[PDB]
Amino acid sequence: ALTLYQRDDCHLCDQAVEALAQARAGAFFSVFIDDDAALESAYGLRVPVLRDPMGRELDWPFDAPRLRAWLDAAP
């Protein structure tokens, strides 16, 4: 499963969600940075950001082909 770091009320984050569906990425779980100072400082200017089990990260912007390619480029 992937980890999608995002914040509440963000069009870019909603778009990442759609990219995950269109690229047919597998399972993913959202982690909202809003109430986490540490996550805010680390991803506050980058969200939405995708992170895989290996620890690799893909920062917005990314469309279906970039996402699907990033996934297939692992590990």
Looking up residue 49, the CATH number of its domain turns out to be 3.40.30.10
This structure's resolution (Å) is: 2.1
- Helix intervals (H) in 1-75: 11-22, 37-43, 64-72
Which residues, including other chains, have CB under 8 Å from residue 68's CB and lie 6 or more apart? 23, 24, 25
Which H or E run includes 34?
A: none
What is the domain range of residue 51? 1-75
Domain count, the chain: 1
CA distance 29 to 11: 18
Q: Is the dihedral of CA 28, 32, 36, 41 positive or negative?
A: positive
Method: X-ray
